[PDB]
Ligand binder design. Structure first.
Ligand SMILES: Cn1cnc2c1c(=O)n(CCCn1c(=O)c3c(ncn3C)n(C)c1=O)c(=O)n2C
Ligand SMILES: Cn1cnc2c1c(=O)n(CCCn1c(=O)c3c(ncn3C)n(C)c1=O)c(=O)n2C
Ligand SMILES: [Co+2]
Length: 573
């Protein structure tokens, strides 16, 4: 019933996030892992944010050379699922910077239909389990903010038809998901990211129709206070503090959930949000709004500047303020950076707002103020979820969590899992794969002299590359490459004592002789259309194949990741 959902930005892997590779995600603590994000143009074609990150980076895996088709985050997500079958993996489309083309795509049925088709192919080739639509937001006119993000599309083509068209798009997605799930024998899910505030909901979100279609919906109950306002507040508070002024009324988890429910949202489908980062203001004066919470709801002075010189009350960020690359002063520090934050903003004292169940940091002399989630407030959100029969918690984002006793970033993720689920292992799911089109031939080679015999074996990858566009052709290529092939041969009364180039080495494992092509640089990625032809040595000469029972192959993403997709490619009759 419950979910623990996590966003992983593709830019986690670069220096700005400390080079955080998916193998250090605590996948056994999550039910759902969202790849953030895939883009798409006005014609419904998928578009990578960063091709290398998605399909090529080695991600710290020994024996992956940059660009090898088994590289990239999307393949690493498959490995996380194999190593942690509690996990479902999924793709988030859109986000704040890549929602610019939803309006046009949703308005036109033929384009909606092409977009859906492209998404279905994408999750087929990546073996993903769900689609997450992050249209942020329908009905909401927004211009790109190129100071914050040179790559921001905004939502400049927003209109009042978005609300209705969004439902059509979700209907088309869920129908296609239904159909492809039955074809592949798997269960797909559809989720969406939703806004916290009434005003955006009224413009873009037909609540009761939406919750009738989706499997669950993630409410973005964070970024609810920030440097865009000159009043300090909680950005991700569980409860509305009674002393909150008009701008922050309704802008808490509890109030947003109550609003969605009142509009027909089913409780079990509602997932609430936790922020793994701060927002904050440079100089907040205590107006005494709540003497029990000094500096909360106080007045922030407009004393700093954005990287385009716009005056702002926002505090400095963890990352340097660069025009087009985090250009707005927003007091944004990762949760794993709270000690860095305290070293830069000295004199911060830690306060707990027991009415909001939210922490904040405030220096009452300088005025500096930061709002965030900690272990305690995550536990309170989980308590609330359990008690209101809600659907779980979602976090933004994985790379900002702190480490504890290993290289995994897992302090808050482990707090969230354990408060939602207890200490027990998460439920595990079956993982299915589509068998590849692999054939083979086995021919005795007559030995007239010497000791032993020989079997000449051929294995052919008959896959064929079909797809167009960068995104679908790269993920198709990866899916249609046979990776680290192991050949399992069962015999009746005959030993395979050796193999010759270009085979990999032979070993005996239980009843099987095993040829390991992952151990051969030339053997470990077998491209669509390639044949491997090679000799096997036998302890006795043969004239037929009656002594061979069966030949199977399995794959691995990396030499040291789990075997998957074991399939029979030859059998004796
Ligand atoms: C705090 N937060 C909470 N919800 C969020 C965010 C957030 O920052 N972004 C905006 C994130 C933009 N972005 C980047 O900044 C980014 C990037 N690739 C490299 N960078 C450097 N991508 C793919 C991306 O989308 C979101 O889209 N959402 C939903
Ligand atoms: C001026 N203003 C007044 N009230 C506001 C805002 C505002 O900008 N944001 C937005 C804060 C989160 N956020 C962003 O930071 C953001 C964004 N798109 C690009 N950016 C960089 N979106 C879609 C978004 O939601 C709000 O959440 N509220 C309540
Ligand atoms: Co309803």
């Amino acid at each position: 019933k419950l979910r623990n959902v996590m966003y992983y930005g593709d830019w986690s892997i670069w220096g700005g996030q400390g080079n955080f590779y998916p193998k250090d995600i605590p996948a056994d603590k999550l039910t759902h892992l969202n790849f953030a994000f895939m883009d798409f143009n006005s014609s419904g074609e998928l578009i990578y944010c960063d091709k290398d990150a998605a399909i090529g980076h080695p991600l710290g895996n020994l024996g992956v050379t940059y660009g090898d088709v088994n590289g990239g985050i999307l393949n690493a997500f498959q490995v996380l699922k194999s190593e942690n079958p509690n996990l479902k993996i999924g793709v988030s489309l859109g986000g704040w910077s890549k929602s610019g083309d939803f309006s046009t795509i949703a308005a036109t049925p033929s384009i909606r239909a092409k977009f859906v088709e492209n998404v279905m192919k994408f999750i087929k080739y990546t073996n993903m389990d769900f689609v997450d639509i992050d249209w942020e937001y329908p009905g909401d006119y927004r211009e790109p903010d190129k100071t914050d993000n040179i790559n921001d599309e905004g939502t400049p083509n927003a209109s009042a038809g978005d609300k209705e068209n969004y439902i059509l798009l979700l209907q088309d997605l869920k129908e296609a998901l239904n159909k492809q799930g039955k074809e592949l024998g798997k269960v797909y899910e559809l989720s969406v990211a939703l806004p916290a505030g009434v005003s955006k909901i009224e413009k873009g979100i037909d609540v009761d129709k939406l919750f009738n279609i989706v499997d669950f919906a993630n409410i973005m109950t964070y970024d609810m206070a920030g440097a865009w306002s000159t009043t300090s507040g909680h950005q991700t508070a569980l409860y509305t503090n009674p002393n909150a002024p008009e701008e922050y009324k309704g802008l808490s988890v509890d109030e947003s959930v109550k609003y969605y429910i009142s509009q027909g949202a089913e409780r079990e489908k509602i997932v609430v949000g936790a922020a793994y980062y701060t927002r904050g203001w440079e100089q907040v004066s205590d107006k005494g709004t709540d003497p029990n919470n000094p500096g909360l709801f106080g007045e922030a002075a407009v004393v700093n500047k954005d990287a385009d010189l716009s005056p702002t009350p926002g505090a400095l960020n963890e990352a340097p303020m660069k025009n087009g690359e985090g250009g707005r002063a927003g007091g944004v520090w990762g949760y794993n950076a709270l000690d860095k934050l305290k070293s830069k903003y000295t004199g911060l004292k830690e306060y707990w707002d027991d009415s909001a169940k939210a922490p904040y940091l405030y220096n009452s002399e300088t005025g500096a103020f930061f709002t965030y989630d900690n272990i305690r407030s995550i536990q309170e959100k989980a308590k609330y979820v359990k008690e209101n029969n809600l659907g779980g918690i979602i976090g933004w984002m994985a790379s900002q969590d702190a480490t504890t006793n290993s290289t995994k970033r897992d302090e808050l993720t482990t707090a969230t899992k354990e408060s939602l689920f207890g200490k027990e292992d998460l439920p595990k799911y079956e993982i299915k794969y589509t068998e590849n089109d692999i054939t083979c031939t086995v021919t005795p080679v007559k030995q007239s002299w010497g000791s032993g015999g020989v079997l000449k074996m051929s294995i052919t990858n008959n896959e064929k590359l079909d797809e167009s566009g960068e995104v679908l052709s790269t993920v198709e290529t990866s899916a249609k490459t046979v990776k680290n092939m192991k050949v399992y041969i069962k015999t009746d009364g005959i030993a395979i004592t050796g193999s010759q180039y270009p085979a990999g080495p032979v070993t005996k494992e239980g009843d099987y002789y095993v040829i390991d092509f992952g151990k051969i640089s030339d053997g470990k990625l077998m491209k669509a259309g390639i044949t491997f032809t090679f000799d096997l040595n036998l302890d006795k000469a043969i004239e037929d194949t009656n002594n061979i029972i069966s030949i199977e192959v399995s794959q691995r993403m990396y030499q040291t990741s789990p075997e998957f997709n074991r399939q029979t490619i030859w059998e004796n009759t």
